[PDB]
Every structure is written in C-alpha cells, then in structure tokens.
Design a protein around this ligand. Structure first.
Ligand SMILES: *[C@@H]1O[C@H](CO)[C@@H](O[C@@H]2O[C@H](CO)[C@@H](O[C@@H]3O[C@H](CO)[C@@H](O[C@@H]4O[C@H](CO)[C@@H](O)[C@H](O)[C@H]4NC(C)=O)[C@H](O[C@H]4O[C@H](CO)[C@@H](O)[C@H](O)[C@@H]4O)[C@@H]3O)[C@H](O)[C@H]2NC(C)=O)[C@H](O)[C@H]1NC(C)=O
Ligand SMILES: CNC(=O)[C@H](Cc1c[nH]c2ccccc12)NC(=O)[C@@H](CC(=O)NO)CC(C)C
Ligand SMILES: [Ca+2]
Ligand SMILES: [Ca+2]
Ligand SMILES: [Ca+2]
Ligand SMILES: [Zn+2]
Length: 414
C-alpha cells in the first residue's frame, strides 16, 4: 500500500560553516526535517526514511553555485557517478547555505529512482525546521512527478506544499491535485526502487515509535494510537500484543508466522530463485539472484541481475510480434558512430563499435509484422537514446555477453 523513499541528504560546506562546524547540530536538523517530511507524505501513502547523510565539512565535492540549474546538474552527475555506486538509496537532496539565484529550491520532475535525476537541491532558507521541511517535501514532490498547483487545486484553507512560492505561514498539506498527479506518475511509470521497505538498521535517524517506520528496538510500529489499525501491535509502545508472533513483514499473516515454505518473493526468471518463509520468522529473506553468467533459457542467454536478457525478447518488447534478431550485417551500422549507431558514450560523445563489439550497440531487428519488410529495424528516440541499445549482459555470441558496450567472454565477464 505504502511506497518508501530511502533518502540520502548531503550538506554543503557553506552550511557547515554557517553552523560553525557543529555536525551534531546539523545532523539533528536533518533528522527533524525528514521526520516532518515523512509526516507530510503520510497523506500520500508514501513513507520517507533517511538512510544516509554526507556532510562536506572539508571541501564540497562539486562546485556549489548560485545558478541553481548548474548546481542541480552537477549534484545529479555526482550522485550518479559517485554516491549511488557506493550507497543504495532512492533519492538524494543537497542542502546549501548558498543563496541560489531566483529560487530557494530546484528539482527534476517525474524522475524518482533515476540515477542522475532522482535529486533536488534545497536552500537552507530558514532556521525554522518546518519551513525547510516544506521546501524538501516540495522538491521531492517534483521528483515524484508533481507539478505546481493552480486553478481549482485545493488542500483546504491552507497554503499547499506545491504552490510556486513558499508561504510565510506554510502548512504541511498537499492539494488534491498533488495527490492524483503523484499517483498517476507512480502507476504509469512505476518507479521500482521505492517498492522495498527499508530495514530498521538501514535508517540512520534516532528511532521514533509512532512514525510508522519499523526501527531498531521496535517489535512493530503502526503510528499513533489514533491511526493504528494493526491489531497485532500496541501503538503507544511499539510492542506486540494479544496472540501475536509478529506484527510486520511479508512472512507475517494475521500476526503469526507464515508456515515454512510459503513463497514470499516470486521468481522473476530462472536466474532469480524465489525466497520462502522459514515458518519461524516474520520477514522474507533478502532477495537472492543466481550468479551472473550462468546459462539460461536453454543456452540462448546468460544470467544478468536476476534476468536472462536475449535479443529475441528485446526485439519483442520494443516492436511487438513477428519481429526477431536481425542478420549480423545489420549490426555493422554500429560502427558508424552516428546518432543511433554506436556502442557507448564518453564525455557525451557517441563511440562507434569496434567490429568485434557491433552486437552490443544499437539493437537491430528483422520486422516481418503485417505488411512490413524491414530487415534492420532499430529503435531510436532522443527522449532517451539508451532505449533500443542492446541490454547489458545480453548474449552476443557463443560464450560471450555484452558488458559496457563490449562483447566479451562470459567466463571472465563476472
Ligand atoms: C480538487 O478539489 C477541489 C475542491 O475544493 C475541486 O474544485 C472544484 O473543481 C471543479 C472543476 O474540476 C469546479 O467545477 C467548475 O466550477 C465552475 C464554477 O462554478 C463551473 O462553471 C460554471 O458552470 C455553470 C454551470 O455548470 C455555469 O452556469 C457558469 O456560467 C460557469 N461559470 C463560469 C464563469 O465558467 C464549471 O463548469 C463549466 O465547465 C464544465 C467543464 O469542466 C462544463 O461542463 C460546464 O458546462 C461549465 O461550462 C465547473 O463545474 C468546482 O467549482 C471546484 N470547486 C470549488 C470549491 O472550487 C477540484 O476540481 C479538485 N481537483 C482535483 C485535481 O481533484
Ligand atoms: C522565496 N522564493 C520563492 O518562494 C520562489 C517564488 C517564485 C514564484 N514563481 C517563481 C518562478 C521562478 C522563480 C521563483 C518563483 N519560489 C521558489 O523558490 C520555489 C521554486 C520551485 O518551484 N522549485 O521547485 C520553491 C519554493 C516554493 C519551496
Ligand atoms: Ca528503495
Ligand atoms: Ca518507528
Ligand atoms: Ca530471489
Ligand atoms: Zn517547484
């Protein structure tokens, strides 16, 4: 029912200096602001939990400029190439003491989970936590596909989060328009990364019994006594009550452990073993995938992150029925290094495929659907040039798979 946003916050040098190096103080503000953001989103069926906090107390890792567009793009690039590679999380917001030009916050729209664009920047505009929490909820809202309110959009007799300007007496309410646009985005784009529920040990803020997030030291958390609908839990204490072996988890049914063997996470493919309940625990074991490189689909592919990517299926997903892998000759076009025919990008440049890597650039399919005859059909859209490119891990020859635009021996690929 609820979606979860595992948030990482970054605090710039200017803000550290502004708080005269008091990291405990900065950390406390962050915990406070996120706690309020989580409360704001309850109405949206979304939980927000702080899973990481990076404080640039020495030097900023990007150049933080007043031009918000430059700063957000630089922060997004840094998150994609640095942070995200060493820290799993769904969204990151940069807090800065710099006075950004024209705005007090900025964020990409409908980008939740995107490696670069699931970001936003927030100006430490006020010492009042509720105020910065509103800015944060607003920027994250954009990330969740929400645009500014207007017209008949209403959130009652209060100043709504998504108004284009911040109110001097800000409320914690989202308008009805925000609610529908956010869920329209989730349902039509289904950002997969916000589906999992973070483990208590993943959350770094001090535990709060009643924030609807299961944390270290709690048996259960179902919000305030008023809101709690978990018959397995005593809201005020976050302790189990009545005939309850458990009050949370995919392996907890009616407050009791699901019997051993009960499937709790379905298999995506032969490369993804299903996980089952132990019968003595309330949680589903962590998701296990078989080793990458393992032969799959009767030797037409090799495993890659729980799936078995093969050209046939990619042609099907892109073009529908009656479309198959094209003849080898079609892939030679990947040596052109033109707008669609290349193997990868370097510093934004499109790099032609070396002859041995042609099967790992743009994918070409033979189209024999009704009334069609296109032996070398490919998919190219400048909305996202990567769509249509051969998927990483795809079998490109007997004993070979694609890895970074290169067709390499599968035995040494992983
Ligand atoms: C969020 O929640 C809020 C609740 O607070 C919702 O607000 C409501 O939005 C409705 C539109 O989605 C509004 O309805 C419109 O109201 C106007 C004004 O009353 C109507 O215009 C008048 O229509 C009558 C006859 O129906 C005419 O005699 C008048 O001449 C019209 N007045 C003028 C100057 O235009 C609207 O009707 C017109 O447009 C429709 C097409 O949409 C058409 O079919 C009609 O023939 C007519 O031309 C329309 O009914 C509500 O007024 C508004 N409520 C409040 C309290 O403001 C909001 O929709 C929610 N949004 C979301 C995203 O959920
Ligand atoms: C004190 N500063 C403000 O309130 C200005 C006001 C404003 C209204 N229309 C504009 C068009 C361009 C630049 C600024 C404005 N707004 C902002 O900083 C908002 C920018 C925004 O929408 N970020 O996603 C974020 C804020 C609401 C939290
Ligand atoms: Ca997540
Ligand atoms: Ca809790
Ligand atoms: Ca699994
Ligand atoms: Zn905005």
């Amino acid at each position: 029912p609820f979606r979860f946003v595992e948030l990482v916050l970054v605090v710039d040098k200017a803000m550290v200096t502004k708080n005269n190096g008091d990291l405990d103080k900065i950390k406390t503000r962050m915990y406070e602001i996120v706690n309020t953001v989580n409360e704001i989103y309850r109405y949206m069926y979304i939980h927000v939990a702080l899973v990481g906090l990076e404080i640039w107390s020495n030097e900023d890792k990007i150049t933080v400029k007043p031009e918000a567009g430059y700063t957000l793009n630089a922060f997004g690039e840094w998150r994609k190439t640095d942070l995200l590679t060493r820290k799993k999380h769904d969204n990151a917001q940069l807090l800065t003491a710099i006075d950004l030009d024209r705005v007090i916050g900025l964020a990409y729209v409908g980008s939740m989970c995107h490696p670069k664009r699931s970001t936003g920047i927030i100006q430490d505009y006020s010492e009042i936590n509720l105020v910065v929490a509103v800015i944060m909820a607003h920027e994250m809202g954009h990330n969740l596909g929400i645009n500014h309110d207007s017209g008949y959009c209403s959130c009652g007799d209060y100043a709504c989060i998504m108004r284009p300007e911040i109110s001097p007496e800000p409320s914690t309410f989202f308008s009805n328009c925000s609610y529908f646009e956010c869920w329209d985005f989730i349902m039509n784009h289904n950002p997969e990364c916000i589906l999992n529920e973070p483990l208590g040990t993943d959350i770094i803020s001090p535990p709060v019994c009643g924030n609807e997030l299961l944390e270290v030291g709690e048996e259960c958390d179902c919000g305030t006594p008023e809101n709690c609908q978990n018959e397995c839990c005593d809201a005020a204490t976050c302790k189990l009550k009545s005939g309850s072996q458990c009050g949370h988890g995919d392996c907890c049914e009616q407050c009791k452990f699901s019997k051993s063997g009960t499937e709790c996470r379905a298999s995506m493919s032969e490369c993804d073993p299903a996980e089952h309940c132990t019968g003595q625990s309330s949680e589903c074991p962590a998701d296990v995938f078989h080793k990458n490189g393992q032969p799959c689909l009767d030797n037409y592919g090799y495993c890659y992150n729980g799936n078995c990517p093969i050209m046939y299926h990619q042609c099907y997903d892109l073009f529908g029925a009656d479309v198959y892998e094209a003849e080898d000759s079609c892939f030679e076009r990947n040596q052109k290094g033109n707008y669609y025919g290349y193997c990868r990008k370097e510093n934004g440049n499109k790099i032609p495929c070396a002859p041995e890597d042609v099967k790992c650039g743009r994918l070409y399919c033979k189209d024999n659907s009704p009334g069609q005859n296109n032996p070398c059909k490919m998919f190219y859209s400048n909305e996202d040039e990567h769509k249509g490119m051969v998927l990483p891990g795809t079998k490109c020859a007997d004993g070979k798979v694609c890895s970074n635009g290169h067709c390499v021996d599968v035995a040494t690929a992983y």
